[PDB]
Design a protein around this ligand. Structure first.
Ligand code: HEM
Length: 154
């Protein structure tokens, strides 16, 4: 249940393209998630209302959360699987006061794939797509183990 060195290299090679504009990519990832799975909006404080006023795009809340989610994820991916230090607190924040089911982590993983396919088709071929899916699977499987310890079924 790990990635090979070459799988990690594929992941970090395409992540280079995301690092050029973390905030723009992160906002896009969340929009993708909310369009494909609008039920995920219920987990935030401000996006349902912004959406109700046709104001999600360019909002301060989308900017803040877009930066947060991909800044954090990039730090985790660069650990290449040795990420317990990051995932213990991250699981706690997504399993306690805010309860984020694993299916929603699955959905944002799919959203990341779709955004990268759309924005960087020439840098996101078959092997890179498979490796990124596998990294994101590892990412939520290790979160899910911590969910179990935390008493959250996911
Ligand atoms: C790639 C997956 C994700 C990453 C890396 C991530 C990252 C973060 C980070 C860094 C925080 C700040 C607290 C902390 O630093 O531990 C946070 C909080 C939070 N996350 Fe996530 N998150 C992810 C997925 C999700 C998803 C899919 C949802 C909801 C559908 C979600 C909902 C929230 C909420 C509601 C908070 C609390 C924010 C607040 O109090 O306004 N997260 N997340």
């Amino acid at each position: 249940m790990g990635l090979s060195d070459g799988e990690w290299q594929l992941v970090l090679n395409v992540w280079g393209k995301v690092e050029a504009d973390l905030a723009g990519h992160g906002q896009e990832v969340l929009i993708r998630l909310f369009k494909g799975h609008p039920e995920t909006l219920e987990k935030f404080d401000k996006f349902k209302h912004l959406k109700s006023e046709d104001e999600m795009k360019g909002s301060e809340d989308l900017k803040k959360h877009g930066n947060t989610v991909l800044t954090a994820l990039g730090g985790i991916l660069k650990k290449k699987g040795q990420h317990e230090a990051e995932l213990k607190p991250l699981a706690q924040s997504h399993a306690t006061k805010h309860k984020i089911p694993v299916k929603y982590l699955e959905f944002i993983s799919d959203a990341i794939i779709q955004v990268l396919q759309s924005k960087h088709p020439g840098d996101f071929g078959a092997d890179a797509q498979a490796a990124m899916k596998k990294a994101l699977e590892l990412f939520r499987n290790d979160i899910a183990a911590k969910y179990k310890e935390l008493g959250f079924q996911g």
